Amino acid sequence: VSGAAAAEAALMRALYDEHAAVLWRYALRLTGDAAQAEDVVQETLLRAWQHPEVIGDTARPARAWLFTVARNMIIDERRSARFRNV
């Protein structure tokens, strides 16, 4: 029903309230730019929404998966396009 579709939004908002700020701090240390940390956070939680396998098990820490995804994103930003211009 429609409540089944609203439950997914409630679940995303819950994982937001529990992981967004900590992931922002982590990305902020790895990059040093807060405006970049916000982008990393948005993209990481977007990939979290696209993977129901990470949001299914609550007895397993999804925070570590979030940190790993953010780390890979940040190291991908650190290549050629930044290399020349930054």
Binding site: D17, E18, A20, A21, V22
Partner: protein, 49 residues
């Protein structure tokens, strides 16, 4: 013990009277929510930092 230590001055009495929250596990979470906002405040998560 706070009244025991800072009793010789009336400004500290007024400080402890005008205080908002009381409790060892309460002011700790207050400091947590004013220091690292946007995070779930656990007694031990603040006891750690």
């Amino acid at each position: 013990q706070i009244v025991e230590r800072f009793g010789f001055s009336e400004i500290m009495r007024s400080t402890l009277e005008k205080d908002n929250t009381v409790g060892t596990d309460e002011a700790l979470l207050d400091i947590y929510r004013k220091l690292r906002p946007g995070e779930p405040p656990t007694k031990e998560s603040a006891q750690t930092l």
